[PDB]
Design an enzyme around this catalytic site. Structure first.
Site, PDB file in Angstrom:
ATOM      1  N   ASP A   8      69.554  -5.296-130.205  1.00 14.66           N
ATOM      2  CA  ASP A   8      69.471  -5.369-128.793  1.00 14.66           C
ATOM      3  C   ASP A   8      70.302  -4.217-128.276  1.00 14.66           C
ATOM      4  O   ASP A   8      71.495  -4.216-128.443  1.00 14.66           O
ATOM      5  CB  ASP A   8      69.993  -6.721-128.315  1.00 14.66           C
ATOM      6  N   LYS A  70      71.735   3.277-120.094  1.00 16.11           N
ATOM      7  CA  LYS A  70      70.430   2.637-120.083  1.00 16.11           C
ATOM      8  C   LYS A  70      69.742   2.703-118.715  1.00 16.11           C
ATOM      9  O   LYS A  70      68.507   2.745-118.630  1.00 16.11           O
ATOM     10  CB  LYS A  70      70.547   1.205-120.544  1.00 16.11           C
ATOM     11  N   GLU A 175      62.470  -7.302-124.463  1.00 11.57           N
ATOM     12  CA  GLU A 175      63.572  -8.205-124.538  1.00 11.57           C
ATOM     13  C   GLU A 175      63.193  -9.671-124.313  1.00 11.57           C
ATOM     14  O   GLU A 175      63.516 -10.503-125.148  1.00 11.57           O
ATOM     15  CB  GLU A 175      64.720  -7.760-123.597  1.00 11.57           C
ATOM     16  N   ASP A 198      67.081 -13.925-117.415  1.00 10.06           N
ATOM     17  CA  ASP A 198      68.030 -13.057-118.147  1.00 10.06           C
ATOM     18  C   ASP A 198      69.128 -12.506-117.232  1.00 10.06           C
ATOM     19  O   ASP A 198      68.934 -11.520-116.529  1.00 10.06           O
ATOM     20  CB  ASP A 198      67.263 -11.927-118.778  1.00 10.06           C
TER      21      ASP A 198
HETATM   22  N1  LIG Z   1      80.987 -17.108-122.504  1.00 11.81           N
HETATM   23  C1  LIG Z   1      80.615 -16.329-121.446  1.00 11.81           C
HETATM   24  N2  LIG Z   1      80.643 -16.878-120.195  1.00 11.81           N
HETATM   25  C2  LIG Z   1      80.273 -16.158-119.106  1.00 11.81           C
HETATM   26  N3  LIG Z   1      79.872 -14.892-119.148  1.00 11.81           N
HETATM   27  C3  LIG Z   1      79.828 -14.308-120.382  1.00 11.81           C
HETATM   28  C4  LIG Z   1      80.177 -14.986-121.562  1.00 11.81           C
HETATM   29  N4  LIG Z   1      80.032 -14.107-122.592  1.00 11.81           N
HETATM   30  C5  LIG Z   1      79.581 -12.949-122.087  1.00 11.81           C
HETATM   31  N5  LIG Z   1      79.459 -13.067-120.737  1.00 11.81           N
HETATM   32  C6  LIG Z   1      79.039 -12.064-119.799  1.00 11.81           C
HETATM   33  O1  LIG Z   1      77.772 -11.590-120.235  1.00 11.81           O
HETATM   34  C7  LIG Z   1      77.611 -10.318-119.593  1.00 11.81           C
HETATM   35  C8  LIG Z   1      76.922  -9.383-120.574  1.00 11.81           C
HETATM   36  O2  LIG Z   1      75.613  -9.913-120.706  1.00 11.81           O
HETATM   37  P1  LIG Z   1      74.479  -9.329-121.655  1.00 11.81           P
HETATM   38  O3  LIG Z   1      75.004  -8.718-122.940  1.00 11.81           O
HETATM   39  O4  LIG Z   1      73.279 -10.206-121.719  1.00 11.81           O
HETATM   40  O5  LIG Z   1      74.032  -8.064-120.775  1.00 11.81           O
HETATM   41  P2  LIG Z   1      73.043  -6.893-121.283  1.00 11.81           P
HETATM   42  O6  LIG Z   1      73.825  -5.709-121.779  1.00 11.81           O
HETATM   43  O7  LIG Z   1      72.144  -7.522-122.332  1.00 11.81           O
HETATM   44  C9  LIG Z   1      72.080  -6.484-119.786  1.00 11.81           C
HETATM   45  P3  LIG Z   1      70.363  -5.916-120.093  1.00 11.81           P
HETATM   46  O8  LIG Z   1      69.689  -7.196-120.507  1.00 11.81           O
HETATM   47  O9  LIG Z   1      69.978  -5.299-118.756  1.00 11.81           O
HETATM   48  O10 LIG Z   1      70.384  -4.853-121.193  1.00 11.81           O
HETATM   49  C10 LIG Z   1      79.018  -9.852-119.170  1.00 11.81           C
HETATM   50  O11 LIG Z   1      79.180  -9.983-117.789  1.00 11.81           O
HETATM   51  C11 LIG Z   1      79.953 -10.829-119.829  1.00 11.81           C
HETATM   52  O12 LIG Z   1      81.193 -10.952-119.126  1.00 11.81           O
HETATM   53 MG   LIG Z   2      70.111  -8.196-122.297  1.00 14.62          MG
END
Ligand SMILES: Nc1ncnc2c1ncn2[C@@H]1O[C@H](COP(=O)(O)OP(=O)(O)CP(=O)(O)O)[C@@H](O)[C@H]1O
Ligand SMILES: [Mg+2]
Length: 381
Positions: A8, A70, A175, A198
């Site tokens: 991912d 990204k 995704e 998501d």
């Molecule tokens: N236990 C938890 N409780 C609440 N938030 C959490 C968490 N663990 C991670 N997060 C939050 O998850 C977010 C990161 O989410 P995720 O990795 O899905 O984003 P991403 O990089 O996949 C976005 P995209 O899908 O656009 O690529 C951050 O804001 C982080 O603080």
């Molecule tokens: Mg994501």
């Protein structure tokens, strides 16, 4: 092909998995985390940091860290989305070969200019090394995921990031589709409507998929490109910054290292509040020598962010309307992204769908990489 990896490649956090001994294994990085920030920075000696080490380096120069690449990958410099996004990024973005290259100082006064896919290649190299350290061997091939709205140039540029990183990206998959695969929703009878919700770091994505005879179709996508867990952090930052100013008369924003320290503790406290009702935030030498000690209740975390939580329902209603569907037409609800670990988020999704339970059992910030890893398993043979 050897052992193919499922990556991912996230806007904010990346995740890598492999299929081994009959199951998906999500792999922890050398800091012990099952997710890695898609983040690059530089030491004074000119060493390049990637992942947790980059995000956690205390700095007074946010302009020489790189993140959110990204948002720029596979786009032209003059794309209006790029011209809007560069307003919020502290690093320099310059036009080069039609594209938004990122310009940074790396140490000793040396400037470098990097294509967004070069930055992404660094993140992929890090995910590649995480997998290799786990497997005890080299990895050459991968399944990489992209958001469902990615167009042709964005998909190709993601593959190119792979190539630069020494990875042959054998498949690019969406995704929300990978999430659905991770839950085995592909292994089902009849035609089904799947809503993927998501909520990530800086992004919110809603995707309506249909599944039929093992084949997924993306019917509609929506969301908000600047809404996610980072906004919830910021609401907490504002709360504690105002409190500190009330208690001491001091405005901590004058010191970036202080703000950086509080952001890190706030992000951690937020995560803990997904599984417990209170958390302590403590920072020594927070500001002008003085220490910081405050607690945050779950209720207070929800109160601060309630309006933002409820705002996520509107893009969902929109994807339903565009897909000519009503709530009762949805057969599967999949939660994706780290912020869907927030109990209040789960509750509000469930209440939007009149009590219907979402899929459960895979960590939502891991589901995408999990799905990628499932396909990587098949390709590894
Ligand atoms: N236990 C938890 N409780 C609440 N938030 C959490 C968490 N663990 C991670 N997060 C939050 O998850 C977010 C990161 O989410 P995720 O990795 O899905 O984003 P991403 O990089 O996949 C976005 P995209 O899908 O656009 O690529 C951050 O804001 C982080 O603080
Ligand atoms: Mg994501």
């Amino acid at each position: 092909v050897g052992t193919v990896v499922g990556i991912d490649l996230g806007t904010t956090y990346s995740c890598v998995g492999v299929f081994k001994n009959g199951r998906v294994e999500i792999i922890a990085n050398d800091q012990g985390n099952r997710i890695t920030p898609s983040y690059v920075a530089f030491t004074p000696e000119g060493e390049r940091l990637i992942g947790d080490a980059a995000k956690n380096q205390l700095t007074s120069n946010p302009e020489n860290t790189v993140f959110d690449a990204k948002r720029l990958i596979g786009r032209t410099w003059n794309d209006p989305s790029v011209q809007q996004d560069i307003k919020f990024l502290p690093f320099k973005v310059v036009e080069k070969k039609t594209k938004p290259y990122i310009q940074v100082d790396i140490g000793g006064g040396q400037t470098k200019t990097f294509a967004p896919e070069e930055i992404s290649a660094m993140v992929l190299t890090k995910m590649k090394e995480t997998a290799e350290a786990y497997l005890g061997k080299k990895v050459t091939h991968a399944v990489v995921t992209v958001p469902a709205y990615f167009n042709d140039a964005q998909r190709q540029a993601t593959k190119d990031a792979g190539t630069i990183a020494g990875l042959n990206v054998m498949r690019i998959i969406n995704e929300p589709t990978a999430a659905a695969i991770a839950y085995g929703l592909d292994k089902r009878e009849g035609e089904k409507n799947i809503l993927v919700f998501d909520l990530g770091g800086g992004t919110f994505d809603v995707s309506l998929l249909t599944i039929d005879n093992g084949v997924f179709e993306v019917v509609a996508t929506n969301g908000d490109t600047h809404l996610g867990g980072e906004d919830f952090d910021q609401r907490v930052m504002e709360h504690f910054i105002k409190l500190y100013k009330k208690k001491t008369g001091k405005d901590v924003r004058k010191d970036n290292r202080a703000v950086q320290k509080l952001r890190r503790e706030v992000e951690k406290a937020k995560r803990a509040l997904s599984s417990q009702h209170q958390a302590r935030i403590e920072i020594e030498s927070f500001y002008e020598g003085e220490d910081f000690s405050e607690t945050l209740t779950r209720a207070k975390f929800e109160e601060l962010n309630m309006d933002l939580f409820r705002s996520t329902m509107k893009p969902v209603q929109k994807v339903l309307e565009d897909s000519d569907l009503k709530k009762s037409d949805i057969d599967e609800i999949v939660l994706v992204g780290g912020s869907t670990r927030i109990p209040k988020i789960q509750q509000l999704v469930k209440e939007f769908f009149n009590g219907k339970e979402p899929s459960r059992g895979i960590n939502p910030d891991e589901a995408v990489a999990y799905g990628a890893a499932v396909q990587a398993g098949v390709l590894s043979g």
